[PDB]
Amino acid sequence: VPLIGSLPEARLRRVVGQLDPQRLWSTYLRPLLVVRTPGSPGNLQVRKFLEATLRSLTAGWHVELDPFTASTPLGPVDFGNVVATLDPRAARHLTLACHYDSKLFPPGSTPFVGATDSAVPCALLLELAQALDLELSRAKKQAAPVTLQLLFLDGEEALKEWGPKDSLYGSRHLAQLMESIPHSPGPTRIQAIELFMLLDLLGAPNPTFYSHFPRTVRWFHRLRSIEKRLHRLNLLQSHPQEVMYFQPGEPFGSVEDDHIPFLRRGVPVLHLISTPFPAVWHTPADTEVNLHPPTVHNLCRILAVFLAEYLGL
Numbered sequence: 099v100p101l102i103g104s105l106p107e108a109r110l111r112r113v114v115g116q117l118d119p120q121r122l123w124s125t126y127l128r129p130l131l132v133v134r135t136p137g138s139p140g141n142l143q144v145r146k147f148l149e150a151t152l153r154s155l156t157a158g159w160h161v162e163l164d165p166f167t168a169s170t171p172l173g174p175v176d177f178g179n180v181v182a183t184l185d186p187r188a189a190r191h192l193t194l195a196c197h198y199d200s201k202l203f204p205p206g207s208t209p210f211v212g213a214t215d216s217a218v219p220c221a222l223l224l225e226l227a228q229a230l231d232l233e234l235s236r237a238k239k240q241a242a243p244v245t246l247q248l249l250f251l252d253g254e255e256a257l258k259e260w261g262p263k264d265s266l267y268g269s270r271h272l273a274q275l276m277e278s279i280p281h282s283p284g285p286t287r288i289q290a291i292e293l294f295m296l297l298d299l300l301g302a303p304n305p306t307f308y309s310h311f312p313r314t315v316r317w318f319h320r321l322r323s324i325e326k327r328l329h330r331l332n333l334l335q336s337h338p339q340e341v342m343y344f345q346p347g348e349p350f351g352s353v354e355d356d357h358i359p360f361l362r363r364g365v366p367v368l369h370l371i372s373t374p375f376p377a378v379w380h381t382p383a384d385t386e387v388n389l390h391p392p393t394v395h396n397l398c399r400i401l402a403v404f405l406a407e408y409l410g411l
């Protein structure tokens with residue numbers, strides 16, 4: 099439905115048409131589907147891949163690492179968050195986030211590559227940035243006062259499921275770091291985050307999302323509206339009912355994740371995580387062949403419209 103603040107149909111269809119499903123799958127997702135536990139060569143290689151892909155965008159993003167070493171159940175480990183801010187001068191930003199590490203499992207099993215968890219989230223952010231690159235470049239050249247920020251967090255997963263401090267390494271570090279860095283008007287980089295939208299556990303068939311935070315329910319309702327509209331406009335696949343993903347009511351459950359260090363510091367959060375979790379969750383079957391590609395692209399389309407409406411692209 100065409101609500102105030104929504105895209106006119108023509109601008110909606112242009113935006114959706116700038117997505118490239120083969121690019122998402124082959125250019126952004128496939129290279130991530132490797133073991134990428136914190137400290138590993140695979141993790142370093144995925145980090146460098148994210149950085150170089152983000153630097154390649156013609157919009158000219160500010161891309162930096164947040165490297166640090168932390169104590170873990172395995173001893174000291176190095177972590178590195180990838181922080182991409184389209185216009186570092188802007189007063190505030192929409193922040194989209196996900197984790198790029200994969201969960202460590204014991205040797206001797208099929209390697210875990212976390213296709214839903216969170217390779218698909220990562221690839222979605224890269225595809226949105228590329229598909230909207232011209233518009234984002236124009237917004238930045240016009241000094242828009244709300245920019246876009248993408249966070250690819252390291253170390254979300256426990257290394258040994260060794261208690262509550264064996265988790266969220268990257269997000270805990272980056273939230274503390276942002277609290278310590280001045281920003282204008284700020285007064286710190288935490289207050290620059292106008293909304294923190296965390297994507298997690300995406301790409302399985304039949305996801306269900308609930309609003310986890312009354313504070314941000316208006317954005318949850320916008321996602322739901324976009325799902326219904328794309329359905330009606332014949333722009334979703336394998337989507338027989340008008341609303342399938344964005345469900346009303348209390349969450350099936352809520353869970354700790356990379357938004358918590360930000361939430362605790364007063365950042366508004368929308369947690370875009372399937373609850374219940376994918377069937378494959380935390381098993382080595384969380385792989386490419388068990389993703390549901392029409393759902394991946396449906397989510398990409400929903401998010402692209404969301405982003406364009408949020409930032410007036």
Ligand SMILES: CC(=O)NCCc1c[nH]cn1
Nearest residue numbers: 215254298299353354355
């Ligand atoms: C309580 C809990 O397991 N939260 C973490 C959810 C998760 C796992 N893997 C990715 N995200």
Ligand SMILES: [Zn+2]
Nearest residue numbers: 201215255380
């Ligand atoms: Zn996980």
